[PDB]
Amino acid sequence: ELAAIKEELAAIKXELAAIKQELAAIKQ
Amino acid sequence: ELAAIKEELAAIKXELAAIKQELAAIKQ
Amino acid sequence: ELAAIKEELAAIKXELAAIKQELAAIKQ
Amino acid sequence: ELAAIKEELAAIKXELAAIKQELAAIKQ
Ligand SMILES: [Cu+2]
Ligand SMILES: [Cu+2]
Numbered sequence: 688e689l690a691a692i693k694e695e696l697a698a699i700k701x702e703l704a705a706i707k708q709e710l711a712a713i714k715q
Numbered sequence: 716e717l718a719a720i721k722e723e724l725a726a727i728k729x730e731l732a733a734i735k736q737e738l739a740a741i742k743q
Numbered sequence: 744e745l746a747a748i749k750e751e752l753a754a755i756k757x758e759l760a761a762i763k764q765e766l767a768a769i770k771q
Numbered sequence: 772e773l774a775a776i777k778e779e780l781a782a783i784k785x786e787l788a789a790i791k792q793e794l795a796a797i798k799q
Contacts (some may be wrong), residue, residue: 744773748776748780751784758790762787762791762794765791765794765795769797
């Protein structure tokens with residue numbers, strides 16, 4: 688169960704990093 | 716409990732994926 | 744630790760709901 | 772492990788809080 692939680696957390700970071708790129712590319 | 720946390724994280728992940736795609740649609 | 748984890752989750756739901764409220768206003 | 776997960780969730784919460792503020796700035 689713990690490994691499956693860390694997998695979900697890793698994918699959330701990916702989404703967060705991708706959302707940050709969209710915000711950093713709208714701003715400029 | 717860990718399995719329930721996993722499901723909630725998976726829903727948060729899908730939440731961020733929809734948020735990311737909407738920002739892409741707004742910007743384009 | 745388990746109760747504090749659920750506290751952090753509930754706060755994530757709040758931010759997610761506020762983010763979608765910002766997205767709906769930007770989309771419109 | 773649970774204490775580290777709480778840190779990860781607290782950091783994700785702070786990421787979403789910053790995203791919310793950036794979206795508010797974009798909306799204005
Ligand atoms: Cu299981
Ligand atoms: Cu603050």
